[PDB]
Each structure stands twice: as structure tokens, then as C-alpha cells.
């Protein structure tokens, strides 16, 4: 695309600059360019890709929630008719959000996942696939809502299976996967008991493996364990 003429290394360099400047749209475009060079991504590069798109879609999701709330209140009894503008603008943001999700899922399918053989990379990309299908599910209302949900479920489940086989219970990728899958269960799949069970089991199994870790790894793992605990506190 537009990044076709720029060196891979220069794209990565500029992605890091964009991060420092909080220019996440730019960061995402640079990382998309890097992916499209066709080489596998390093651990650091995978994280740059994730950070960029998480921030972009994060802003869109927050905007969508604001507009959806306004729209929902417009369709209450006693609410004055204000015309099509709220729906139109919500639809505009929604379409742009769906576009970003489709872009990420496209990168994963062409060809990040198929080339990813190590557990760390494969679990990372499958978690991402689950996440971006989950974001599509957040705004889905039509025929394909069930299929979008199933796509998220399937990606998360494959990731969980690999992570349980190949990674320690304290691995931050494994922990973040379980966290997000538990949110999927609670928010998307209408399965709060599964969400709670997964969060509890994940936390407890990590707790039991902390003794194996260095100070720095301990800090990393306990950070994410706290997020699991925060959700458990909210949900129980």
C-alpha cells in the first residue's frame, strides 16, 4: 500500500516514534506496512502491532458506546423526535470500527497466523483474532451476530488449548488471553458463571506458579492477576 516504498526497519522505527507522540493511527499504519513486508514479527514487533490497533479501536469503541447510549435514550417513550442524525452518526462510527477490525483480521489471515509456529506467536495472534471478532460482536445486531460470536469463541478456544499445553500458568500472554476470554463469556456469550469460573481458575493456577519467577517476571504476572481479581470483585 502507501507504505510499500518504505523500509521495514524504518516503519518499525516510526511506529515507535508514533507511540511516543501518541499518534496511534499513524502507528497502526506503520505496523500494517511492516506486516505487509511478509516477514514474521518479533515479540517486540507483535506488541507494537497490538498496542497500535488496541488504541485505535479503543477510541472508536468508546465513541460508539457514547452514541449508542444517546440513540437508546432517543427511542424511549416521551422522547422528542430529533430525526435520523443520531442513528446516521452512530452508523458512521460503527462502519469505521468494523473497517479497522476487518483490517486486523485480514492481517492475521494473510498471513500472520499460518506462519506462526511457536506457541508464543501463535497464541498471541489467535488471542488477537478472538479480540477483534469480540469487538465486531459488541456492535453486531443482524443475521451474522451468532457467527461472529462463534468466530471469537473458536479463536479464543484454540489459543487456550495451545497455551495450556505449551506455556506456564503465569505467562502474561496466557494470562491476558484468559482475562479476555472471561470478558467474552461475561459480556458477549451471556455466560457469567463460565466467566467467573475461568477467572478464578486462571488466578489460582498462576498464584501457585509465582514461586518459579524472577522479581521482574513476578511483577509482570501479578499485574495481570490483579485485573482478573478486579473483574471477580465486580462480578461477585
Amino acid at each position: 500500500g502507501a507504505m510499500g516504498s518504505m523500509e521495514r526497519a524504518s516503519l518499525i522505527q516510526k511506529a515507535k516514534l508514533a507511540e511516543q507522540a501518541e499518534r496511534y493511527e499513524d502507528m497502526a499504519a506503520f505496523m500494517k506496512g511492516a506486516v505487509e513486508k511478509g516477514e514474521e514479527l518479533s515479540c517486540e514487533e507483535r506488541n507494537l502491532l497490538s498496542v497500535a490497533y488496541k488504541n485505535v479501536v479503543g477510541g472508536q469503541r468508546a465513541a460508539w458506546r457514547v452514541l449508542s447510549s444517546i440513540e437508546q435514550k432517543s427511542n424511549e417513550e416521551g422522547s422528542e423526535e430529533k430525526g435520523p442524525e443520531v442513528r446516521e452518526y452512530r452508523e458512521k462510527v460503527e462502519t469505521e470500527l468494523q473497517g479497522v477490525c476487518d483490517t486486523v483480521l485480514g492481517l492475521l489471515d494473510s498471513h500472520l497466523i499460518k506462519e506462526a509456529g511457536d506457541a508464543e506467536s501463535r497464541v498471541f495472534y489467535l488471542k488477537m483474532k478472538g479480540d477483534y471478532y469480540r469487538y465486531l460482536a459488541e456492535v453486531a445486531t443482524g443475521d451474522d451476530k451468532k457467527r461472529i460470536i462463534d468466530s471469537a469463541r473458536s479463536a479464543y478456544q484454540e489459543a487456550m488449548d495451545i497455551s495450556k499445553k505449551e506455556m506456564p500458568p503465569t505467562n502474561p500472554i496466557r494470562l491476558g488471553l484468559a482475562l479476555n476470554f472471561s470478558v467474552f463469556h461475561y459480556e458477549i456469550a451471556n455466560s457469567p458463571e463460565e466467566a467467573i469460573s475461568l477467572a478464578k481458575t486462571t488466578f489460582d493456577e498462576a498464584m501457585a506458579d509465582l514461586h518459579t519467577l524472577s522479581e521482574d517476571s513476578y511483577k509482570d504476572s501479578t499485574l495481570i492477576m490483579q485485573l482478573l481479581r478486579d473483574n471477580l470483585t465486580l462480578w461477585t
Binding site: 497490538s50 479480540d131 494470562l175 509482570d220 473483574n231
Partner: peptide
């Protein structure tokens, strides 16, 4: 507060 999803980086 809103529930947490993953924000680990790395």
C-alpha cells in the same frame, strides 16, 4: 467501574 480487559505490553 468498567470491567478490565488485557492491557499488558512486554
Amino acid at each position: 467501574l468498567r470491567r478490565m480487559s488485557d492491557e499488558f505490553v512486554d
